[PDB]
């Protein structure tokens, strides 16, 4: 797996000129240092192992933060349960790495980290808490209260996590509708027709393929409500596995603006430097 | 034989050149039909061959000294090209490759350079605050194509949002520096070396076959890397022409005809 060695070379006086080329053809000149200067024989032992796709993508990255509360319910606005749409566009670090390529195909891994704290110092009484994380595929009914019938999880996957234990962990297969995920989509979902009564019959947003790509995650605490409020947050980490990619693209150069390819703010990424200054 | 002289022939049409550079095959793959072990729909496909696989010529554009660029998309640019367009609108699904030939000639005393790029899934940015708000009619220009701009001016129309693009040239219209665009298949037309560029494009998509009226899977961008100049005058301008020919086309799901509103 080591890189190719370097061959010894001597002086040259010949009719063949490897130094001249024409980039108009759309090809890169495959030169080596021995083709332009004298070189010695060197056995090469460096390798490219740490640069493969698996090694490049073998890291867990944060993608979302979910906040839930636990206090005796009133009629005011409360967060006894929360819902989050699965997507990787809420953060930029993993999005930029994925967008080097047009299509991809991989398994997925999830890890959940949970933390909690008090909000008032009046009592300081609370027992250990248990969290439920339920996955709601598209088309399934969604909860309307923290204790309705939907939480029976008859057929939806669910995780029960007890506070203070090791982070939960899950694996998921390739769940795409097509043969590969599409990071970019140049099209619409509906097309207006001359016979339509009004515009909305065909109106749609540019580059949006489907409404619910993967569903939502619903989070709650199963414990009843203690005399004092307790607040918690759940952090989700993502790691691709068994990765394949096609059709490379240039990387993003300006700040993201929404889930599309739009750009608003800076548009001036390069700094100043003299033409003849080292 | 020299690689500067080349001839192409498809259907009942022929093209000749005498100052070409060479031919490029994107990703080293030639167009082909669908295989049995890769099919998905079960209906019998239709493949007219000669009736659709031939060169069509778009309208010519004039390379001014202050022009910023032009862009097209496929198969959108070929909506009205006879039987290809008819088959596109009469069927639900479609698939085909393309061959792109760009023409531009000038004397030995002119100077300049054009960059020709073929981009898969060529998304473009909007012109207003509302994200992804451009409309179908404005996003599908036809053979007329579009243009780039030198800077981003935020739309402030009072009557209506106007729902159009606003591609910036040095950002390539999608938020990436133009310098890195050479990872895509490309060629350069340098007026002292050659006068045409040829690129062969296979079918690139995440599916074996997809709808043609909804999704565009290739984009063509032409940008002047070096501005045009002529001897001690500033009114000079020369034309540019683009020719395209579908290859290995097949259409599957038949129904009544579609009629988009533009």
């Amino acid at each position: 797996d080591s890189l190719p060695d370097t061959k010894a070379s001597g002086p040259a006086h010949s009719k063949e000129v490897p130094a001249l080329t024409a980039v108009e053809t759309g090809a890169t000149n495959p030169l080596a240092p021995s083709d332009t200067v004298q070189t010695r024989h060197v056995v090469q032992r460096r390798s490219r192992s740490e640069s493969t796709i698996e090694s490049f993508f073998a890291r867990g990255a944060c993608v979302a933060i979910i906040e839930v509360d636990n206090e005796q319910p009133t009629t005011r606005a409360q967060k006894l349960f929360a819902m989050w749409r699965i997507t990787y566009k809420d953060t930029v670090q993993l999005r930029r790495k994925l967008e080097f390529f047009t299509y991809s195909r991989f398994d997925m891994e999830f890890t959940f980290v949970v933390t909690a704290n008090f909000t008032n110092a009046n009592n300081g009484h609370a027992l250990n808490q248990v969290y439920q994380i339920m996955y709601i595929p598209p088309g399934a009914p969604t909860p309307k209260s923290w204790d309705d019938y939907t939480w029976q999880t008859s057929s939806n996957p669910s995780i029960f996590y007890t506070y203070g234990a090791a982070p939960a962990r899950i694996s998921v297969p390739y769940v795409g509708l097509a043969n590969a995920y599409s990071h970019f989509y140049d099209g619409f979902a509906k097309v207006p027709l001359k016979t339509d009564a009004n515009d909305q019959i065909g109106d749609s947003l540019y580059s949006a393929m489907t409404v619910d790509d993967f569903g939502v995650l619903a989070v709650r605490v199963v414990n009843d409500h203690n005399p004092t409020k307790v607040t918690s947050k759940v952090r989700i980490y993502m790691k691709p596995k068994h990765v394949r990619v096609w059709c490379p693209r240039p990387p993003r150069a300006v700040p993201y603006y929404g889930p599309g390819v739009d750009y608003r703010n800076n548009l001036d990424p390069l700094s100043e430097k003299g033409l003849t200054t080292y | 034989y020299s690689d500067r002289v080349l001839q192409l022939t498809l259907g009942n049409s022929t093209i000749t050149t005498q100052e070409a550079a060479n031919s490029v095959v994107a990703y080293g793959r030639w167009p082909e039909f669908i295989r049995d072990d890769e099919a998905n729909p079960v209906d019998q496909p239709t493949e007219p061959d000669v009736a659709t696989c031939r060169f069509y010529t778009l309208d010519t554009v004039m390379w001014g000294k202050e022009s910023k660029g032009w862009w097209w998309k496929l198969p959108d640019a070929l909506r009205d090209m006879g039987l290809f367009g008819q088959n596109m609108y009469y069927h639900y699904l479609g698939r085909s490759g393309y061959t792109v030939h760009v023409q531009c000639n000038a004397s030995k005393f002119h100077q300049g350079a054009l960059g020709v790029f073929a981009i898969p899934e060529y998304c473009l940015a909007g012109d207003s605050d509302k994200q992804r708000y451009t409309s179908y009619a404005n996003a599908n220009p036809g053979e007329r194509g579009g243009k780039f701009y030198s800077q981003f001016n935020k739309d402030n129309a009072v009557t209506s949002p106007k729902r159009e693009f606003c591609p910036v040239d040095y950002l390539l219209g999608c938020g990436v520096l133009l310098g890195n665009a050479f990872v895509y298949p490309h060629q350069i037309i340098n007026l002292r070396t050659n006068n045409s560029a040829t690129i062969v494009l296979p079918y690139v998509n995440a599916l074996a076959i997809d709808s043609m009226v909804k999704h565009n899977n290739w984009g063509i961008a032409i940008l002047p890397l070096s501005p045009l100049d002529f001897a001690q005058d500033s009114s000079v301008e020369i034309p540019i022409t683009v020719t395209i020919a579908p290859m290995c086309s097949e259409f599957n799901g038949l129904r009544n005809v579609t009629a988009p509103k533009f």
Partner: antibody
Amino acid sequence: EVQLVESGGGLVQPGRSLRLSCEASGFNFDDYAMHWVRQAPGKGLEWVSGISWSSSSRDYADSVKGRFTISRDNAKNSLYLHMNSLREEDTALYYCAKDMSYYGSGGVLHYYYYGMDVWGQGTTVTVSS
Amino acid sequence: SALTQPASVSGSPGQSITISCTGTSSDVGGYDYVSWYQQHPGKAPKVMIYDVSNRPSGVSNRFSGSKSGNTASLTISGLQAEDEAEYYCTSYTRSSTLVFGTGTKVTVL
């Protein structure tokens, strides 16, 4: 079931700034459009501003364009209205309303504002020198 | 500009009354999003009709609506004393804004 509560109204001098607030409960506030409507004493209803389920889409009426601003905070189920360079003509009763938009026939988004089906009791703002 | 509505309409008990709201092609005449609201003095508006002809749950069948050309109409049948209130029309505009009507007051003789 569904409740909207407004607050922040008061008395201010011309040319100064004020902010209003609206809290919502009983429904998935994170996934609906919202509106602001004002009624001058003894006059008809006037549409002021509206925001869709995405903060990008955000519209204003000509009478307040360039002066007012609308924003939402899905983490607290709160809807805000920021007013600057107030005028005596702005004195009116302000309502917080919920749109029935979204939930179209699938592949559609940034829908037109269908209309309002729930109204709050409103808060009073008076501008006088 | 606000949609045009009549200043007021009068009718005797047991009769039927109609109210008209008019706009342009960038308005009622261009889209099907038209709704009607009812307001008693000192009360928040209540929705009566939406999408031109749909009634919300719990609304009496005595209310109905229709549209034609650039004009939309609200019809009240079996007029009663309690129907005395103000009514407004609303519509979506192609400039991405809602517009309210001038308003009409119903008087029961």
